[PDB]
């Protein structure tokens, strides 16, 4: 209760930041990312074991820069994030604000063997309030770092349909709770995810649609988060999405994402923005 | 091969649905444009732009038969089909079944469908496809006749008595047999009675005499 | 109340040019100094009307019209001016 | 479809022709050409499958 | 005479009519001996013949011309600072187009012509890859890789001839800038062959403002150096004596209105021969002379430079023609809209006289509708008569509408599942339809607004609106009164001027409040003209039907609209219940935003945005608590919580809880707090005074290709909210909410960049006068609309 | 942009200069192409700078240093330079320098403070050559304004047909028995007498009539020297145009135009062009034309014959002692690390070479 759901909220704040390929940077495949006119507003909910519930709204805004080389696409640029998780299982109420910044880069080769590097640093101020526990305010000012390294290939099965695998290792130097009513240590999270991405695309005379999928699998190697240390996690992240860029259109499809059985399971993350100019 | 397209020349799109024989037209023109069996499929650029409802896109090749083939026996025949690709831009499918009158809109597309029909009846006294245009030009006659009537309708709504009498005389010189001149005649006596000039207003005073409609 | 914009009708009228016209002037001299009229009446003959009608905001209407008839030769231009409207 | 017309074929229907007179006295249109059909019409036939070869 | 073996092998591969029937050798060959410019070099040379050997007889016929391979769509690989849009006209102007084959000897005409396109920098020898294709046939693709020859760096810029001014003042006055500061981005060394006509015209007009009428160069200019890193500029200016501009006399009759032009052309005695004043005095024939009937005036003026007495005078002329009357107006391009929807924002009708201020007044009113952006003026004259001119306006007919479920921000109103089915302007009739079925964290607001902008002749607008709030105020940083409301109102607006927007109209309002917490601030309203509510439990229902009369006034003197640089925006909004409704109250709200610039390029503007408001009962009653004013986050005073400035809530001690929770912001509970219970939850007030000064100094981040979107600003806010009906003598030991208290102020930085997912309004501030009960926030952004 | 730096070839070390005084005169040269060359006369090394100050040196170690201010033009809050780019030439104890602000100075050898100045409508960019009491100043506009040595009373001006698309105006005109041959800034040869400049004869020497798409062809900063009754002028993409002094009409070019300066030494006349390769052209015939294309694009300056070797500069401060008959002898040393841009001279057995940081050396090898 105290170390399982009251002080273990920093692990769910770390898991709400990691995402897929087209969610941390946007649609960068066959899309000219010259101007920084992009924004990724994603909302959703999540529930863990023990009557836990989450309600986060993670937004993204930034600017990129296009730089071409001898077969090595180098798209640089930085971004700023903001996440508001309404963590309230049965006794507390989270009002965090994960305000931070960060930059990224790409190493897109000829055969689709991209090595994407992402580095971001966020700082969230907590506003927990223990209800029916006789406590007051627990405002913290801890910080979080991210040193993820996306690696993946691409197999051109068809001229319109492609199959690509993924293998990412996300590194961090998060501290945890320093005024837990208890100190903490500088443990490093080792969240790693493998899996293949089922892709399918169509086109036409002047319109184009995209029907993606995904059957990735998370498998972390090191997990010693103690403020009792944590254990290993094993879950599958099915993420089926859809996109369409017609000239009288912006978006058409949803951004469905569901987690499998594990410690913390993200329920749904639909981000549909289907609007029309007529 | 010249025989791989003529073997399926009788197999048009009456069995296939959309895209079975569209790309087969662009086969012989990319290799040789002066073949004896290839001359019927190279000059078909005005229909692949027309079949997919791209009406302003197909208008870039209407002036093709004027310069290269002036001695064709079908010059009198191609002057009728120019109004078919211009009247589709006059009325749209949005105001089709909603009951919206398209007469109070841009008459620029109606004159493009009229200039080819004007040269058809004055260029040749005895053509072969004229009696279908007689039922078609009567729709173009009343469409651009109610355009200036709505301009005359607005100027009586504001009080501009000089501006309305210049529009009905614009309807009095080139509209002899339309419906819009039946209702434009009370607009003449309303502007003349509001103005101090009454030397000729008694001649145009009576309107409803025998035409009780 | 609601304000009214400028409602200008007919062609412009100047006090110096309206006085120096006689009866029987041809159509070339009238349409040169005063200009072509904005009123064309093809009813039988071809008479010209020079109306100076303006309506400013909340001040009513004014009107100063003319009536100059013609013929096939361009004579009998009788002076029929109405400077005070009713 | 070589000799065929497709797209928006809703131009076949139209309005009937109505003829009016001038009961006010000698008010006739005398200057046509910019918006009016000429006085003659001609004669022809009706059909489909337009020869669209220039 | 006619040779039978003129046809060769391999010539019928690509072209069989353009390479075989394009020669007069068949059916009409007459010349046989001097066949030099009749068959091979007359008509066949343009098609595919570019050889040297003459066609001889059959006994020595060894011509055997082989057909060369054709060319496909050449994809220019290695695009070094060059796009494929402008790299298209270099193939058919001077070269070989598609279809015809490259004969491997006209390739120099294709090669020379690519280096003659790079005239912006001056590359006279560009490394263009003139190689041969490895693949033999079947739509070959050439290899064309463009590279840069020289660099584009300038060495230095020096100026001589400073006889009256200093040296360093002329660098900042021009467009040249070789130093970057710590507050801007520009200041790099960039050269252009088209910018030489931009920095030299401001040099002549600068010294022309000092009386130097003899300003001329000494028969030399800047030498043309196409980036050889050896440039050398030299401008030897010559100045004279500071003259004095005398009075301008009127020579000739200026269309019978020469007596009204002398009072503006005459200047004060003692003014020099100004350069920027003579340009702004030749266009004075349109403010009062061209507004009568004239469309195309012609007025010249020559300089009489008298160096004897140092007195310069000018003589005006007039070459006017006829009265320039107006004929019928044509409107072309109205495809999706009707003709009658755009004939009223003109202020210039047919059968009138052309005014100079009657054309641009209708041009700025036709562009402010939002239906199109390409508005031009085509004043075409009739070739038949020299009068009765025609005017033609241009349209674009762009689309409008929105449908999408874009999630909003998360820092002020929480997560917002905004549906927003914004069915925009209709099929051409001009009806501003609007539906906004949003759903925030604390509200479920839906709308249905059909507004007709022209119900009467001139400007009267009639439009209804149906709404349904159903908002829960416990999530809006308030205490209680989960309210379920709906209603319907109409509005008939009467404009009295060109900038005033006086409105009027009635409206029905229904209210159904439940689960209201017992407190002193809201039960005083229930005690006045009502029953005593149950203080023993929750769910205190209270229905209210209103028939209020709404009025308003809007002053919209503004220039740009989107990002204003100069002007004022005053908006008033008031309402009052009619006798016959449930309650009797009235409230007014005054908005003011004034943009005052302190520069000439409109980039340094002071924004004095204020905000007022007041409301009270109509005698013996009280204003309802669900109509109070709120000063909160990034709308009035940036730097605080959402709806926290104002009077707090003091609760009534009773056991009115349903299932007896721990606290629930209520005294007399199981905790033991019986007497002297209060909190810090804002409940709004009867009045509100919010003022804010703001500076719109630009940002040192984006100065490359766009600057009209990112708007970084610095501000300093101020605000207070108090109650007017709070008892100061009945309650002791409490802060008196019956006077204008200490002003809560804040300051910080702002940002108004437009994102593709809605406008992003970012404002980071820091509180300066934070007091007890006023929670403060720092990061307050706003994205999603 | 289109080619990179050439690698360093093998070296041959036969002599090593040891003494090299490093006196940082002025305040810095900078990235400005000028012709401010040092001079040596009466055991006094003359070193100037574009800031306005001039300091004399000596041949042994560089003593006898005086600092005067001749180009200040501001006596209110600070000083201001005049961008001196004419050249330091000594003629009869009077140093005549130029400026980019249309100023011509006359530096004295006694104290250097008294310096009378005149006003010229053009800018001083060429090397000031003084002969027969006349200071020949060739401006960038093509005008020729001579100046007297005492006060400069009469200033005759003559202009030629000079079109646009020109780079510089640093051609230094010399005299030949009263006929001052002037290097034309339009691909012409102007052998005019230095009295008023009445008779002007022009002959097009470049290939601007053959080529159409060109940028810079009628501009050379070269000096015509006249030995044994034979003139030697140059052109861009042309060659030597060895006329007679009697205004002839016959002309012949071969190939390989130059932009830098040259010197005549008997039969093997050394030439350095834009490709940074040295060669020796004869009078007629073109005998044993050897090339030095192994050191291309290294910013080679004007070569001088110092103790039987052609010493040139480099972009990074290297040395290349090129041989006089074949050029296969390469010698490299290390006297500077900034770079060499000023064309060195050779007089009185002392190599006067100025680098890009405003220092002069005396290499004795």
PDB file of N, CA, C and O in Angstrom, chain A residues 36-39 41 43 57 59 61 78 82 84 99 132 248 272-278, chain E residues 399-408 410 415 417 662 701 753 756-757 760 779 781 783:
ATOM      1  N   UNK A  36       8.752  23.185 -38.796  1.00  0.00           N
ATOM      2  CA  UNK A  36       8.392  22.590 -37.525  1.00  0.00           C
ATOM      3  C   UNK A  36       6.926  22.733 -37.175  1.00  0.00           C
ATOM      4  O   UNK A  36       6.575  22.938 -36.009  1.00  0.00           O
ATOM      5  N   UNK A  37       6.058  22.625 -38.181  1.00  0.00           N
ATOM      6  CA  UNK A  37       4.615  22.721 -37.977  1.00  0.00           C
ATOM      7  C   UNK A  37       4.074  21.323 -37.692  1.00  0.00           C
ATOM      8  O   UNK A  37       3.499  20.650 -38.551  1.00  0.00           O
ATOM      9  N   UNK A  38       4.268  20.882 -36.451  1.00  0.00           N
ATOM     10  CA  UNK A  38       3.779  19.582 -36.019  1.00  0.00           C
ATOM     11  C   UNK A  38       3.472  19.632 -34.530  1.00  0.00           C
ATOM     12  O   UNK A  38       4.184  20.285 -33.761  1.00  0.00           O
ATOM     13  N   UNK A  39       2.403  18.946 -34.135  1.00  0.00           N
ATOM     14  CA  UNK A  39       1.993  18.877 -32.740  1.00  0.00           C
ATOM     15  C   UNK A  39       1.315  17.538 -32.501  1.00  0.00           C
ATOM     16  O   UNK A  39       0.435  17.143 -33.270  1.00  0.00           O
ATOM     17  N   UNK A  41      -0.799  15.796 -29.808  1.00  0.00           N
ATOM     18  CA  UNK A  41      -1.631  15.839 -28.611  1.00  0.00           C
ATOM     19  C   UNK A  41      -2.253  14.461 -28.433  1.00  0.00           C
ATOM     20  O   UNK A  41      -3.110  14.048 -29.221  1.00  0.00           O
ATOM     21  N   UNK A  43      -4.043  11.740 -25.615  1.00  0.00           N
ATOM     22  CA  UNK A  43      -4.681  11.499 -24.331  1.00  0.00           C
ATOM     23  C   UNK A  43      -5.016  10.020 -24.202  1.00  0.00           C
ATOM     24  O   UNK A  43      -4.956   9.257 -25.170  1.00  0.00           O
ATOM     25  N   UNK A  57      -2.595  13.223 -20.219  1.00  0.00           N
ATOM     26  CA  UNK A  57      -2.776  13.960 -21.469  1.00  0.00           C
ATOM     27  C   UNK A  57      -1.414  14.529 -21.854  1.00  0.00           C
ATOM     28  O   UNK A  57      -1.053  15.635 -21.444  1.00  0.00           O
ATOM     29  N   UNK A  59       1.122  16.083 -24.386  1.00  0.00           N
ATOM     30  CA  UNK A  59       1.192  16.859 -25.612  1.00  0.00           C
ATOM     31  C   UNK A  59       2.652  17.008 -26.019  1.00  0.00           C
ATOM     32  O   UNK A  59       3.574  16.835 -25.217  1.00  0.00           O
ATOM     33  N   UNK A  61       5.234  19.457 -28.826  1.00  0.00           N
ATOM     34  CA  UNK A  61       5.374  20.584 -29.745  1.00  0.00           C
ATOM     35  C   UNK A  61       6.861  20.874 -29.924  1.00  0.00           C
ATOM     36  O   UNK A  61       7.622  20.898 -28.952  1.00  0.00           O
ATOM     37  N   UNK A  78      14.735  20.035 -31.938  1.00  0.00           N
ATOM     38  CA  UNK A  78      14.392  19.878 -30.535  1.00  0.00           C
ATOM     39  C   UNK A  78      12.894  20.072 -30.338  1.00  0.00           C
ATOM     40  O   UNK A  78      12.186  20.562 -31.222  1.00  0.00           O
ATOM     41  N   UNK A  82       4.753  18.258 -22.385  1.00  0.00           N
ATOM     42  CA  UNK A  82       3.939  18.611 -21.224  1.00  0.00           C
ATOM     43  C   UNK A  82       2.951  17.480 -20.985  1.00  0.00           C
ATOM     44  O   UNK A  82       2.133  17.181 -21.861  1.00  0.00           O
ATOM     45  N   UNK A  84       0.180  15.764 -18.092  1.00  0.00           N
ATOM     46  CA  UNK A  84      -0.630  15.985 -16.896  1.00  0.00           C
ATOM     47  C   UNK A  84      -1.343  14.682 -16.550  1.00  0.00           C
ATOM     48  O   UNK A  84      -2.399  14.376 -17.114  1.00  0.00           O
ATOM     49  N   UNK A  99       6.820  19.049 -17.341  1.00  0.00           N
ATOM     50  CA  UNK A  99       7.300  20.065 -18.270  1.00  0.00           C
ATOM     51  C   UNK A  99       8.788  19.848 -18.499  1.00  0.00           C
ATOM     52  O   UNK A  99       9.581  19.878 -17.552  1.00  0.00           O
ATOM     53  N   UNK A 132      -8.256  10.331   3.290  1.00  0.00           N
ATOM     54  CA  UNK A 132      -8.495   9.312   4.328  1.00  0.00           C
ATOM     55  C   UNK A 132      -7.186   8.695   4.821  1.00  0.00           C
ATOM     56  O   UNK A 132      -7.102   7.492   5.075  1.00  0.00           O
ATOM     57  N   UNK A 248      -8.514  17.567 -49.800  1.00  0.00           N
ATOM     58  CA  UNK A 248      -9.546  18.138 -48.934  1.00  0.00           C
ATOM     59  C   UNK A 248      -9.623  17.389 -47.610  1.00  0.00           C
ATOM     60  O   UNK A 248     -10.702  16.984 -47.187  1.00  0.00           O
ATOM     61  N   UNK A 272      -7.974  10.486 -32.616  1.00  0.00           N
ATOM     62  CA  UNK A 272      -8.517  10.741 -33.947  1.00  0.00           C
ATOM     63  C   UNK A 272      -8.770  12.230 -34.172  1.00  0.00           C
ATOM     64  O   UNK A 272      -9.345  12.907 -33.316  1.00  0.00           O
ATOM     65  N   UNK A 273      -8.359  12.733 -35.339  1.00  0.00           N
ATOM     66  CA  UNK A 273      -8.475  14.145 -35.706  1.00  0.00           C
ATOM     67  C   UNK A 273      -9.016  14.299 -37.129  1.00  0.00           C
ATOM     68  O   UNK A 273      -8.469  15.036 -37.951  1.00  0.00           O
ATOM     69  N   UNK A 274     -10.111  13.602 -37.432  1.00  0.00           N
ATOM     70  CA  UNK A 274     -10.692  13.585 -38.776  1.00  0.00           C
ATOM     71  C   UNK A 274     -11.494  14.860 -39.025  1.00  0.00           C
ATOM     72  O   UNK A 274     -12.635  14.985 -38.579  1.00  0.00           O
ATOM     73  N   UNK A 275     -10.893  15.832 -39.711  1.00  0.00           N
ATOM     74  CA  UNK A 275     -11.625  16.995 -40.205  1.00  0.00           C
ATOM     75  C   UNK A 275     -11.375  17.286 -41.678  1.00  0.00           C
ATOM     76  O   UNK A 275     -10.475  16.742 -42.319  1.00  0.00           O
ATOM     77  N   UNK A 276     -12.201  18.204 -42.175  1.00  0.00           N
ATOM     78  CA  UNK A 276     -12.661  18.250 -43.553  1.00  0.00           C
ATOM     79  C   UNK A 276     -12.831  19.709 -43.950  1.00  0.00           C
ATOM     80  O   UNK A 276     -13.257  20.530 -43.134  1.00  0.00           O
ATOM     81  N   UNK A 277     -12.491  20.032 -45.192  1.00  0.00           N
ATOM     82  CA  UNK A 277     -12.562  21.398 -45.703  1.00  0.00           C
ATOM     83  C   UNK A 277     -13.609  21.431 -46.816  1.00  0.00           C
ATOM     84  O   UNK A 277     -13.281  21.362 -48.003  1.00  0.00           O
ATOM     85  N   UNK A 278     -14.874  21.554 -46.421  1.00  0.00           N
ATOM     86  CA  UNK A 278     -15.987  21.603 -47.365  1.00  0.00           C
ATOM     87  C   UNK A 278     -17.201  22.266 -46.718  1.00  0.00           C
ATOM     88  O   UNK A 278     -17.624  21.884 -45.625  1.00  0.00           O
TER      89      UNK A 278
ATOM     90  N   UNK E 399     -12.533  27.270 -49.561  1.00  0.00           N
ATOM     91  CA  UNK E 399     -13.437  26.426 -48.797  1.00  0.00           C
ATOM     92  C   UNK E 399     -13.343  26.737 -47.306  1.00  0.00           C
ATOM     93  O   UNK E 399     -12.390  27.358 -46.829  1.00  0.00           O
ATOM     94  N   UNK E 400     -14.355  26.290 -46.565  1.00  0.00           N
ATOM     95  CA  UNK E 400     -14.401  26.488 -45.123  1.00  0.00           C
ATOM     96  C   UNK E 400     -15.198  25.358 -44.484  1.00  0.00           C
ATOM     97  O   UNK E 400     -16.065  24.748 -45.114  1.00  0.00           O
ATOM     98  N   UNK E 401     -14.886  25.080 -43.226  1.00  0.00           N
ATOM     99  CA  UNK E 401     -15.512  24.001 -42.481  1.00  0.00           C
ATOM    100  C   UNK E 401     -14.502  23.254 -41.630  1.00  0.00           C
ATOM    101  O   UNK E 401     -13.304  23.226 -41.915  1.00  0.00           O
ATOM    102  N   UNK E 402     -14.994  22.634 -40.558  1.00  0.00           N
ATOM    103  CA  UNK E 402     -14.161  21.863 -39.644  1.00  0.00           C
ATOM    104  C   UNK E 402     -15.024  20.826 -38.941  1.00  0.00           C
ATOM    105  O   UNK E 402     -16.224  21.033 -38.741  1.00  0.00           O
ATOM    106  N   UNK E 403     -14.405  19.700 -38.581  1.00  0.00           N
ATOM    107  CA  UNK E 403     -15.141  18.569 -38.024  1.00  0.00           C
ATOM    108  C   UNK E 403     -14.446  17.848 -36.874  1.00  0.00           C
ATOM    109  O   UNK E 403     -15.090  17.026 -36.216  1.00  0.00           O
ATOM    110  N   UNK E 404     -13.184  18.134 -36.588  1.00  0.00           N
ATOM    111  CA  UNK E 404     -12.310  17.147 -35.969  1.00  0.00           C
ATOM    112  C   UNK E 404     -12.263  17.193 -34.448  1.00  0.00           C
ATOM    113  O   UNK E 404     -12.477  18.225 -33.809  1.00  0.00           O
ATOM    114  N   UNK E 405     -11.929  16.027 -33.889  1.00  0.00           N
ATOM    115  CA  UNK E 405     -12.014  15.667 -32.476  1.00  0.00           C
ATOM    116  C   UNK E 405     -10.706  15.964 -31.762  1.00  0.00           C
ATOM    117  O   UNK E 405     -10.235  15.161 -30.953  1.00  0.00           O
ATOM    118  N   UNK E 406     -10.083  17.094 -32.092  1.00  0.00           N
ATOM    119  CA  UNK E 406      -8.757  17.401 -31.589  1.00  0.00           C
ATOM    120  C   UNK E 406      -8.766  17.662 -30.096  1.00  0.00           C
ATOM    121  O   UNK E 406      -9.514  18.527 -29.611  1.00  0.00           O
ATOM    122  N   UNK E 407      -7.960  16.905 -29.350  1.00  0.00           N
ATOM    123  CA  UNK E 407      -7.865  17.080 -27.908  1.00  0.00           C
ATOM    124  C   UNK E 407      -7.147  18.390 -27.613  1.00  0.00           C
ATOM    125  O   UNK E 407      -6.194  18.767 -28.309  1.00  0.00           O
ATOM    126  N   UNK E 408      -7.616  19.108 -26.597  1.00  0.00           N
ATOM    127  CA  UNK E 408      -7.054  20.396 -26.240  1.00  0.00           C
ATOM    128  C   UNK E 408      -5.812  20.296 -25.380  1.00  0.00           C
ATOM    129  O   UNK E 408      -5.015  19.355 -25.490  1.00  0.00           O
ATOM    130  N   UNK E 410      -3.923  20.752 -21.337  1.00  0.00           N
ATOM    131  CA  UNK E 410      -4.132  20.061 -20.080  1.00  0.00           C
ATOM    132  C   UNK E 410      -3.750  20.843 -18.839  1.00  0.00           C
ATOM    133  O   UNK E 410      -3.623  20.259 -17.759  1.00  0.00           O
ATOM    134  N   UNK E 415      -8.223  17.939 -19.782  1.00  0.00           N
ATOM    135  CA  UNK E 415      -8.386  17.274 -21.070  1.00  0.00           C
ATOM    136  C   UNK E 415      -9.755  17.615 -21.650  1.00  0.00           C
ATOM    137  O   UNK E 415     -10.769  17.641 -20.939  1.00  0.00           O
ATOM    138  N   UNK E 417     -12.272  16.711 -24.802  1.00  0.00           N
ATOM    139  CA  UNK E 417     -12.677  15.919 -25.964  1.00  0.00           C
ATOM    140  C   UNK E 417     -13.618  16.752 -26.835  1.00  0.00           C
ATOM    141  O   UNK E 417     -14.812  16.480 -26.968  1.00  0.00           O
ATOM    142  N   UNK E 662     -14.609  12.452   5.116  1.00  0.00           N
ATOM    143  CA  UNK E 662     -13.661  12.999   6.083  1.00  0.00           C
ATOM    144  C   UNK E 662     -13.778  14.518   6.180  1.00  0.00           C
ATOM    145  O   UNK E 662     -14.179  15.054   7.219  1.00  0.00           O
ATOM    146  N   UNK E 701      14.742  34.200 -32.496  1.00  0.00           N
ATOM    147  CA  UNK E 701      14.820  32.784 -32.838  1.00  0.00           C
ATOM    148  C   UNK E 701      14.495  32.497 -34.296  1.00  0.00           C
ATOM    149  O   UNK E 701      15.169  31.670 -34.914  1.00  0.00           O
ATOM    150  N   UNK E 753       2.443  31.662 -31.170  1.00  0.00           N
ATOM    151  CA  UNK E 753       2.692  30.974 -32.429  1.00  0.00           C
ATOM    152  C   UNK E 753       1.495  30.117 -32.817  1.00  0.00           C
ATOM    153  O   UNK E 753       0.931  29.399 -31.987  1.00  0.00           O
ATOM    154  N   UNK E 756      -0.423  23.958 -36.366  1.00  0.00           N
ATOM    155  CA  UNK E 756      -1.423  23.346 -37.261  1.00  0.00           C
ATOM    156  C   UNK E 756      -2.555  22.624 -36.543  1.00  0.00           C
ATOM    157  O   UNK E 756      -3.550  22.283 -37.197  1.00  0.00           O
ATOM    158  N   UNK E 757      -2.448  22.381 -35.239  1.00  0.00           N
ATOM    159  CA  UNK E 757      -3.511  21.767 -34.452  1.00  0.00           C
ATOM    160  C   UNK E 757      -4.230  22.805 -33.595  1.00  0.00           C
ATOM    161  O   UNK E 757      -4.627  22.533 -32.460  1.00  0.00           O
ATOM    162  N   UNK E 760      -1.641  28.199 -30.650  1.00  0.00           N
ATOM    163  CA  UNK E 760      -0.934  27.924 -29.404  1.00  0.00           C
ATOM    164  C   UNK E 760      -0.639  29.253 -28.717  1.00  0.00           C
ATOM    165  O   UNK E 760       0.148  30.059 -29.222  1.00  0.00           O
ATOM    166  N   UNK E 779       3.361  27.693 -15.803  1.00  0.00           N
ATOM    167  CA  UNK E 779       3.268  27.286 -17.199  1.00  0.00           C
ATOM    168  C   UNK E 779       1.795  27.215 -17.587  1.00  0.00           C
ATOM    169  O   UNK E 779       1.074  26.312 -17.151  1.00  0.00           O
ATOM    170  N   UNK E 781      -0.285  27.310 -21.047  1.00  0.00           N
ATOM    171  CA  UNK E 781      -0.425  27.304 -22.496  1.00  0.00           C
ATOM    172  C   UNK E 781      -1.862  26.972 -22.883  1.00  0.00           C
ATOM    173  O   UNK E 781      -2.691  26.605 -22.048  1.00  0.00           O
ATOM    174  N   UNK E 783      -3.728  25.257 -26.400  1.00  0.00           N
ATOM    175  CA  UNK E 783      -3.677  24.707 -27.751  1.00  0.00           C
ATOM    176  C   UNK E 783      -4.930  23.871 -27.988  1.00  0.00           C
ATOM    177  O   UNK E 783      -5.348  23.094 -27.123  1.00  0.00           O
TER     178      UNK E 783
END
